[PDB]
Amino acid sequence: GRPQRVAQEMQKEIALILQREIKDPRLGMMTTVSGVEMSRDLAYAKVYVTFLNDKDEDAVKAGIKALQEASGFIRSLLGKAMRLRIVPELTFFYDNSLV
Amino acid sequence: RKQVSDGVAHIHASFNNTIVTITDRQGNALGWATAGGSGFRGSRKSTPFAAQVAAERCADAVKEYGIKNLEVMVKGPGPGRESTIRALNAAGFRITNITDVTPIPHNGCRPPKKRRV
Amino acid sequence: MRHYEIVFMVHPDQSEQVPGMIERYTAAITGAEGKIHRLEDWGRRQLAYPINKLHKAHYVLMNVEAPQEVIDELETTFRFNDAVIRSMVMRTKHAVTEASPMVKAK
Amino acid sequence: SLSTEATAKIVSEFGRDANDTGSTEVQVALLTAQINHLQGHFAEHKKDHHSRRGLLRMVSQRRKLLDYLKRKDVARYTQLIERLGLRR
Amino acid sequence: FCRFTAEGVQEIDYKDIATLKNYITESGKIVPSRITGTRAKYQRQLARAIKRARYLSLLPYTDRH
RNA sequence: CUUGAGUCUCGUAGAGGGGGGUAGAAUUCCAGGUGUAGCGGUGAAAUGCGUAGAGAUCUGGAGGAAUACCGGUGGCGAAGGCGGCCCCCUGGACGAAGACUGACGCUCAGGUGCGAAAGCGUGGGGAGCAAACAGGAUUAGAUACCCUGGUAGUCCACGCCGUAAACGAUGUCGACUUGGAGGUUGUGCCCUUGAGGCGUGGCUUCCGGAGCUAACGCGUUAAGUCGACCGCCUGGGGAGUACGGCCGCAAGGUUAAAACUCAAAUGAAUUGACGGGGGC
Ligand SMILES: [Mg+2]
Ligand SMILES: [Mg+2]
Ligand SMILES: [Mg+2]
């Protein structure tokens, strides 16, 4: 509901599914999510995930599409993991955590 | 006093908290770094930037025994954990390996109920 | 008597009785219609994972068509005794007398 | 459940010949022996209701055969019931 | 993709550590037949076989032990 | 009479059941060691908790609880259901092949059982969890949600209890009728032969023809065609209630009215509006 509040709980759930439940990992790394940006009513979630892949869009691109290609499947995963009627639309963003 | 030269540290890459410790080669952990202990609190203790800066607190204990190598462990998938590893590489201490050792059980422990909106 | 394949280890350090206890165990086999169809020892082999803070346990194997009871006291023995460090007993569809992956290396 | 050897021993006497395997007698005798083996299991395992479920599936079976036999020749039935020491 | 059938073993002796190691990760988790393409029964036989070998200490539960 | 039915022999898979073992993580605790200034909590704090040295790390132990990967439409089951390894006991399924029996059948009121979780009973047991209750964070209904605790309960054994949206919201059995793609597990043949080619069984899945259906759909695992038996309903509300019985120790369940009241209740689809939504 209150987006800025639910964001903390969702980030923990997103990390658990991301690390132990992968069989097409172009990242092949511990990719860590810096932050999420859920819309009002949680209709759209913006997942900003940094890539342990040498921080180069070459390796990063492999995973971000891989992040996007398996979304419906992972949707189910997070969708059946917090009893949410809103299954958040999934978006993925390499973060310039390092500047 | 006594040189070790083969660095081995323990971190606790929890979400809401971020804490590294210095360890002797044969267990016997000696000294530690708490990012929450720096006075960072709430979101500030959890910030990936706080974890990256906590390097100096870990480094001073390492400097006292003058340890060089890096055999450190990560337990817990903290946000921006890779950036903290980048900060340890930015420090320039010789790196031998990092261990992604988030403990996985067999479901033996009963989990507590998740919080709700 | 019915088929079995059996493997256990004794503590490597107590290998003084390891050659004799086998047949001393087969005393049951040899003395109670035990048709040992095969037996293998492999000797001390490094444990993939340490058991009771021990390494290089003394590996040994047995293949018998044995009656219901003999195996019981046989394993309770192991359950009783302590030189042995871990035990195992599994039924087999039929008798196995072919080089085992451990020995077949030799 | 059974040993084929025990089934062969029952088939030799209860059956007219070894091949005679459908004869109601040769059927009820096997079911009665199976019930006795199951009863020994139930003596210490009352919880194993699932196995009791089959137990029913057969006591009723012969029960049908008995009648089918009884309505066919009490003669054999009469001896069978006492041959198998049942319904005393 | 019928590779155990090429080996010809309808029943897989569990003592075969070399085959077990290929079907075991560095962590020690069993790779699924999704990628190894093994038939289910062998998949079934291997999972039970790995645990018994693991109990005998032939296979590690996880290197961290 | 032998195809229905059923037995024998040959197998064959299976988290089927019951029992007894046993392993490894994890978590808690406890032990130590080294090692501290915190710790964990929130949106933030509070709350918690630390120099008794906590927090962290190894080393050790104790306890209880559950069995990651594998593992899934994948099986097992009447169903509820069944998920670490071993052994003991034991049910059923299925294939093949042949023989034996010879209608030995189906359904089932009444019947007797079976039975998710919580709950009751006794005594157990006590990790972790968590109603109740408890400390901090409050007024649109804060009575709070959140965090911090936390008993019962949660486990065992024996008992009761007998209901769940126990749901395929699809009774049981049998027969008949277009397809295709799967899965699974049998097994025959014919290739050396994996693979491959012919098969042929079982079970399962997704489309889908005809057909049927208000529509939705269903669709050889029919809601198509049929048969046999059973079970049930007759507008909605009152109401699965008062009360009576029965059962239960209770809790309670089961059985089941009527009074009064109303013009609809209501299903499927369809077309739009809006929005506390978002794409272009
Ligand atoms: Mg319970
Ligand atoms: Mg009901
Ligand atoms: Mg159910």
SS (H, E, C) chain B: CCCCCCCEEEEEECCCCEEEEEECCCCCCCCEEECHHHCCCCHHHHCHHHHHHCHHHHHHHHHHHCCCCCEEEEECCCCCHHHHHHHHHHHCCCCCEEEECCCCCCCCCCCCCCCCC
Helix ranges (H only) for chain D are 4-14, 24-44, 49-70, 74-83
Cβ separation E57–C57 shorter than 8 A = yes
Specify which residues C63 forms β-bridges with: C5, C38
Q: Are C39 and C22 in contact (CB under 8 A)?
A: yes
Of B77, B82, B115, the CB nearest to A15: B77
Q: Please check whether strand F approaches the CB of E1 to within 7 Å.
A: no
Tell me how many domains chain B contains. Answer: 1
- CA-nearest of C31, C22, C2 to C90 is C2
- CA-nearest of A55, A39, A28, A56 to A91 is A39
Cβ separation A29–B82 shorter than 8 A = yes
Q: Are C62 and C96 in contact (CB under 8 A)?
A: no
Tell me how many domains chain C contains. Answer: 1
To probe the interface with B, which of A31, A33, A50 has the most B CB atoms within 10 Å? A50
**Residue C16: strand, helix, or coil:** coil
Report how far residue A18's alpha carbon sits from residue A20's, in angstroms, rounded to the nearest whole number.
6
Rg (CA), chain C: 14
DSSP A68: H
Nucleotide nearest to B115 (CA to C1'): F146
Domain that holds residue C28: 1-92
CA A52 to chain B, closest CA, distance in angstroms equals: 5
Contacts of B11 (CB under 8 A, 6+ apart): B18, B19, B20, B21, B72, B73, B74, B75, B84
Report how far residue E48's alpha carbon sits from residue A24's, in angstroms, rounded to the nearest whole number.
26
* C-alpha of residue C58 to centroid of ligand 3, in Å: 50
For domain A3-94, give its CATH number from 3.20.20.120, 3.20.20.140, 3.30.300.20, 2.40.50.140.
3.30.300.20
Q: Is residue C100 part of a domain?
A: no
Q: Is residue C104 part of a domain?
A: no
Q: Please check whether strand F approaches the CB of B107 to within 7 Å.
A: yes
Q: Are B84 and B56 in contact (CB under 8 A)?
A: no
Specify which residues B71 forms β-bridges with: B97
Residues of E in contact with C47 (CB under 8 A): 57
Q: Are B14 and B45 in contact (CB under 8 A)?
A: no
Within 13 A of B5's CA, how many CA atoms are on the CB side?
Answer: 1
Report how far residue D66's alpha carbon sits from residue D72's, in angstroms, rounded to the nearest whole number.
9
**B100 lies within 8 A of chain A by CB:** yes
Residues of C in contact with E54 (CB under 8 A): 49
Report how far residue B24's alpha carbon sits from residue B22's, in angstroms, rounded to the nearest whole number.
7
Report how far residue C52's alpha carbon sits from residue B85's, in angstroms, rounded to the nearest whole number.
36
| Burial state string for C13-45 with b = 16 or more CB within 10 A and e = fewer than 16 | eeeeebeebbeebbebbeeeebebbebbebeeb
CA B3 to chain A, closest CA, distance in angstroms equals: 32
Dihedral over Cα of E37, E41, E44, E45: its sign: negative
- CA-nearest of C95, C71, C76 to C3 is C95
Cβ separation A29–B85 shorter than 8 A = no
Residues of A in contact with B83 (CB under 8 A): 32, 50, 97-98
Q: Which two tokens stand for residue A71?
A: 């979304």
Domain that holds residue E31: 1-65
Q: Is residue C4 part of a domain?
A: yes
* C-alpha of residue D50 to centroid of ligand 3, in Å: 19
Q: Residue type for A37, please?
A: E
Q: Residue type for E21, please?
A: K
Cβ separation B80–A16 shorter than 8 A = no
Tell me how many domains chain E contains. Answer: 1
Report how far residue A8's alpha carbon sits from residue A35's, in angstroms, rounded to the nearest whole number.
9
Domain that holds residue B96: 2-117
Q: Are A17 and A81 in contact (CB under 8 A)?
A: yes
Nucleotide nearest to C89 (CA to C1'): F86
Nucleotides of F under 7 A from a protein CB: 5-10, 12-19, 21-27, 32-45, 55-60, 64-72, 74, 77-80, 84-92, 98-105, 114-115, 127-130, 145-147, 158-159, 183-186, 194-196, 276-279
Q: Which two tokens stand for residue E59?
A: 């296979």
Residues of E in contact with C49 (CB under 8 A): 54, 57, 60-62, 65
- Give backbone dihedrals phi and psi of E53, rounded to 5 degrees, phi first: -65, -40
Expressed in Å, this structure's resolution amounts to 4.2
Report how far residue E57's alpha carbon sits from residue C58's, in angstroms, rounded to the nearest whole number.
12
Largest CA distance in chain A: 38
Going by their DSSP bridges, the two strands B32-34 and B18-23 should be labelled as antiparallel
Rg (CA), chain A: 13
Rg (CA), chain D: 14
Q: Name the method of structure determination.
A: cryo-EM
| Burial state string for A50-79 with b = 16 or more CB within 10 A and e = fewer than 16 | bbbbebeeebbebbbebbeebeeebeebbe
CA B117 to chain A, closest CA, distance in angstroms equals: 7
Q: Which two tokens stand for residue D69?
A: 């036999």
Q: Please check whether strand F approaches the CB of D51 to within 7 Å.
A: yes
Residues of E in contact with C57 (CB under 8 A): 57
Number of Cβ within 10 Å of residue B33's Cβ equals 24
Q: Which two tokens stand for residue C101?
A: 């992956």
Contacts of A83 (CB under 8 A, 6+ apart): B116
Q: How far is CA B91 from CA A51, B65, B86, C31, C60, in A?
A: 20, 17, 9, 72, 53
Smallest-distance ligand from the CA of B110: 1
Report how far residue C32's alpha carbon sits from residue C69's, in angstroms, rounded to the nearest whole number.
10
Report how far residue B32's alpha carbon sits from residue B42's, in angstroms, rounded to the nearest whole number.
20
- Give backbone dihedrals phi and psi of B20, rounded to 5 degrees, phi first: -110, 160
Dihedral over Cα of B12, B17, B22, B24: its sign: negative
Within 13 A of E3's CA, how many CA atoms are on the CB side?
Answer: 9
Q: Residue count of chain D, please give it.
A: 88
Q: Give the Cα-Cα-Cα angle D5, D6, D10 (nearest 5 degrees).
A: 115
